[PDB]
């Protein structure tokens, strides 16, 4: 569609910022992203106008808003409605897969294989079920650019590994991993695939049925949606096979002291009262984003982070972890004879949001041998302007810290 | 005492119209109204400091992250409990399923007997029909009688040596029972009986010193206590939190990742995983401080006077029948009338603007008690008025009429 990206930005209320006395500059998407005013102002209409429970009159509007949220989440991601359960993030997405698809089937012997790359989100739970059922956890290897290593994880995908726990695109490299070839590859050697989509779903058009996969996870605050938000996508046959993970009201049909029957997926694995109005806010996300146009989005990104990269490999002495052929705008960056954490302390002061530390993927950082690095990364309604005014900063923080 | 009128245009919802009539919200116990200053509490988050918390670098994560810290301790003080033995979740359900999970998954086995009352919600309920699935626990029944009272005599006579866990109600969302969880919380822990609190119905509409209540865990949920959808709360005795294993894993409950081995945080952290709902644990301090400035004891006596005029007036109706008139209660009355079907009282109520809930409130048990497949339900809360509840009365008499 082409939009106006200048007319875009002006929907973010948040950008007005001023922090330190100074306009902000937010380059910290992949911590969360911002909210456009039309996401803003569903939730608060929703708590002024007809918020009830999901009848009567408010009641009935309440409802007929959450479930439309899902339907416009799951054209989002081009899934069926009923294959697509709601929750509070990405963490409990796959906790939910480890504890009811992995949990009642794994046993010694069997292999879980995890990229090195992964978010923690992506590798605890598979902890905590291998200590419970006696499996081991195999790690899939990465190579010094960022990538993955594909024939190295053809040879680790042998009999005993029962599943794969893959990004779709890194948080702290930005690597785009060609999840489709992936888990077309793991399904003939009858591997699951649980796909973390975290940071694939803000960035580009992702069809998730195309895939292939197992599972897939998203997480709402970082593309547009309400914080508290979030959804699992699942093969049918899967959502049917597992058993409930929370119990409780809305995700049962009939309770008795003599049995209880519980209601099929997806309200199956939704107990409780939902968080109504973040769900209303996410379906007005994900719709405000197909708006825009998912692909018109990841190429405004791509010039963003081609103009980003071209001006940071001009600094002496800085080098970018994450340097694959294919990534999202997401860059991070060390600076010889400059601690990270520095830096981030110092950019603050300038106005801009920078994150420095760990990203909550240790595992990843161990194997390229730092202790943090310094991350930006860029949304469709961060500026080319602000770009160059980033490297302006940039070199005074470093002069300051020479 | 608090002006009452001026706290009610406090909840700006109040003011619009259903069906070209005015609204009259009775549906409480569903879910609770907010009041402006949550409202705009959200917002200005959204608006002005969304960033996300914990290791905060920058401005924004820092006012973020001493926000939602801040929540906790309000919470914490509303509660009177200690903040770092505070765990903030999604609501009840998932505070009680916690507990299924990390507390008696790992520890019950078969011949254990899981105790839960008649009158508890689902949340209350299903959690510990997963841990008999998967431990051979089995779960006993504690009766009540007619009135809608827990049967103390049979509690004591059920919590027998082979009874490891009770859960129990301190607010019946159907009943509107006030139970005593105090002497039944000593009376459990001198048997050795761990309690499970659900405090659903409680923190709402009256003040709860939850540590002077002596129970093991007690769980509480934020949009029924003027505060955002999504929030929520599970307190517990520190030694639970120390030796419980963690449940969700993921990032900000861990301390150290490696895949040789993984160091978890310290309570409550080491249950929070991944990104919180930010804005509605925002919210939710704000929900907290709001029902402590008006004084949570101010609250309870003023949904008292609503409750005995409703029920003094209700009970002029011919042939109303209310399921559960206990001696202390809290402000929700369910109740039936002969030869009107609940649903059809709810459809028509709310073509004259009354919001009412009918059906079985997610209580299925309780209702298989007393035989009845639905009731009415009205729940009224301090931003009611007398007015609304004559309002309410004559809605009644022209439906009830009109069937």
Redesign the interface.
């Known amino acids: 569609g082409a939009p106006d990206w200048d007319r875009v930005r002006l929907d973010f ?2 950008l007005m ?1 001023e ?2 006395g100074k306009p ?1 500059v ?1 380059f ?1 998407n992949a ?2 992203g ?2 456009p005013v039309q ?2 102002g569903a ?2 209409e929703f ?7 999901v ?5 009935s509007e309440a409802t007929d808003a959450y479930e439309g949220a899902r339907n416009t989440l799951a054209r989002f991601l081009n899934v069926r409605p009923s294959d697509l359960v709601l929750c ?5 997405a ?2 939910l897969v ?2 009811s698809w992995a949990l009642p089937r794994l046993k010694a012997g069997d292999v879980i294989l ?1 990229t090195r790359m992964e ?3 992506n ?3 598979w ?2 079920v291998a200590q419970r059922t006696g499996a081991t ?1 195999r ?1 899939a290897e990465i190579t010094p650019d960022g990538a993955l290593d594909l024939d190295a994880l053809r040879a680790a995908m042998t009999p005993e590994v029962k599943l794969l726990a893959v990004t779709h695109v890194s948080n702290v490299l930005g690597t785009v991993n060609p999840v489709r070839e992936i888990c077309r590859e793991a399904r003939k050697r009858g591997i699951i695939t649980v796909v973390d989509g975290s940071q694939a779903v803000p960035h580009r058009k992702v069809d998730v049925a195309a895939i292939g996969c197992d599972f897939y996870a998203i ?1 709402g ?1 970082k593309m547009c949606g ?4 979030g959804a699992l996508w699942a093969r049918r046959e899967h959502l049917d096979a597992m ?2 993970f ?7 049909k ?4 003599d049995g ?1 029957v519980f209601n099929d997926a997806p309200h199956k694995f939704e ?8 769900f209303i806010g996410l379906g007005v996300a994900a719709d405000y984003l197909q708006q825009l146009g998912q692909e018109n989005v990841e190429a405004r990104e791509a010039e963003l982070l081609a103009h980003f990269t071209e001006e940071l490999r001009r600094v002496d002495g800085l080098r970018i972890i994450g340097e694959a052929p294919e990534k999202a705008a997401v860059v991070s960056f060390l600076i010889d004879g400059a601690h990270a ?1 520095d830096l ?2 110092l ?2 002061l300038e106005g ?6 760990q990203h ?1 993927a ?2 990843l950082l ?1 194997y390229f041998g730092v202790a943090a690095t310094c991350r930006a990364s860029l949304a469709f309604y961060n500026t080319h302007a602000e770009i160059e005014r980033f490297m302006t900063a940039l070199t005074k923080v470093r002069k300051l810290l020479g």
Do not use: W
């Not at 708590?47 to 429970?53: G, I, P």
């Not at 509070?88 to 409990?92: E, M």
């Open positions: 209320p948040l910022r922090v330190h902000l937010y910290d911590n969360t911002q909210k996401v803003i939730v608060d708590y002024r106008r007809y918020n009830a429970n009848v009567h009159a408010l009641g509070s993030g990405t963490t409990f796959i906790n480890a504890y995890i978010h923690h989100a590798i605890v739970p902890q905590l956890i790690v997480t605050h309400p914080t508290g938000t058993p409930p929370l119990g409780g009201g809305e995700m049962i009939e309770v008795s002291f209880t107990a409780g009262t939902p968080n109504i109005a973040g954490h981030a302390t950019l603050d801009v949001a920078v994150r420095s530390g909550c240790h595992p161990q």
